[PDB]
Every structure is written in structure tokens, then in C-alpha cells.
Write a protein that binds this ligand. Structure first.
Ligand SMILES: *[C@@H]1O[C@H](CO[C@@H]2O[C@@H](C)[C@@H](O)[C@@H](O)[C@@H]2O)[C@@H](O[C@@H]2O[C@H](CO)[C@@H](O[C@@H]3O[C@H](CO)[C@@H](O)[C@H](O)[C@@H]3O)[C@H](O)[C@H]2NC(C)=O)[C@H](O)[C@H]1NC(C)=O
Length: 136
């Protein structure tokens, strides 16, 4: 029977032979009637894993970008200041928080001048921390 075939092959029900998957195709399961066409990673994408007869190629994003979604279906540009990288992609810092860093970092809460026993000299932004004053 055609079900005794190993991975990296294709096999037909009417004439059972475990013929090797040809170049730039693959099969992970076994003795299917076809091989699947190998993925290519170009443009904004790069190869994280390459294709072989047994496994598919897997993609990365280029420098300055990052994978978005389940199986890196798209690339997103790395976050600006005032944004943070989350699972749903770059998102703006919520009120009271900030991030001054470009293409990196995490939204951290504003300095609390009352907690330090000080006055507020300048107000906070999504991209800028509060500036505190003297001690009261
Ligand atoms: C400076 O920080 C104080 C206290 O900060 C506390 O500790 C920090 C390390 C963080 O964990 C903070 O999340 C935490 O607040 C801030 O004062 C607090 O403000 C909150 C939000 O307005 C007050 O909550 C309210 O409390 C009343 C009852 O008192 C409720 O009815 C409201 O529904 C609401 O929950 C909270 O009372 C207050 N806490 C204290 C201990 O004072 C302050 O906002 C902050 N200042 C600045 C300028 O950012």
C-alpha cells in the first residue's frame, strides 16, 4: 500500500511507488499524490528556514521590520517613538505612559513628581517624559 511511503516523497494509488519530491517542492506527511510548492522569501521577507524535500521554507522580515501575524504573513515597520511593539503590531502608548526610543523599547509610565516630593516643570507626551522641578 501507498501509505507505507516516507516523508519527502509522492505516491499514486493506481501505481504505488515512493517517487522523490522534485526540486523546489516538498511533502512533510508522506505518500500523498502531490508535493507542495516551496515557499519563497523575497523583498521585505528573508529566509529563516530554507526549503527541503521534507519541510517547507519559513520566512523572517528584513532589518527595520518585524513579522506580524500567525506565520509571518506580513512585515510591519519597526515602531516609532510614542509607539510600543505588541502582539497586534505597533500600537501607540496609552495615556499617562511614554516611550522616547526609536525602533525599540516599551511604554513606561510618566515620572510622578508628587511621589518624589516635587513640582511639575513640563508635561508628559507619548514620546516624552514629564520633567520635575524643585522639592516644595
Ligand atoms: C502619583 O501616584 C499616586 C499613587 O500612585 C500609586 O502607586 C504607583 C506606584 C502606581 O502603582 C499607581 O498606579 C498608583 O496610583 C497617584 O494617586 C492615585 O491616583 C489614583 C488614580 O486617580 C487614585 O485612584 C482613585 O481612588 C479613589 C479612592 O481614593 C477611587 O474612588 C477612584 O475610583 C480611583 O481609583 C488613587 O486614590 C491615588 N492613590 C494614592 C495612594 O494616592 C497619582 O495619580 C500620581 N500622580 C500623577 C501626577 O501621576
Amino acid at each position: 500500500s501507498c501509505d507505507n511511503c516516507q516523508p519527502g516523497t509522492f505516491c499514486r494509488k493506481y501505481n504505488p511507488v515512493c517517487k522523490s519530491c522534485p526540486p523546489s517542492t516538498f511533502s512533510s506527511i508522506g505518500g500523498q499524490p502531490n508535493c507542495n510548492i516551496c515557499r519563497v522569501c523575497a523583498g521585505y521577507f528573508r529566509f529563516k528556514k530554507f526549503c527541503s524535500s521534507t519541510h517547507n521554507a519559513e520566512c523572517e522580515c528584513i532589518e527595520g521590520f518585524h513579522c506580524l501575524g500567525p506565520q509571518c504573513t506580513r512585515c510591519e515597520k519597526d515602531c516609532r517613538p510614542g509607539q510600543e511593539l505588541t502582539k497586534q503590531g505597533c500600537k501607540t502608548c496609552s495615556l499617562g505612559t511614554f516611550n522616547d526610543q526609536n525602533g525599540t523599547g516599551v511604554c513606561r509610565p510618566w515620572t510622578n513628581c508628587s511621589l518624589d516630593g516635587r513640582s511639575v516643570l513640563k508635561t508628559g507626551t507619548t514620546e516624552k517624559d514629564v520633567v520635575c522641578g524643585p522639592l516644595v
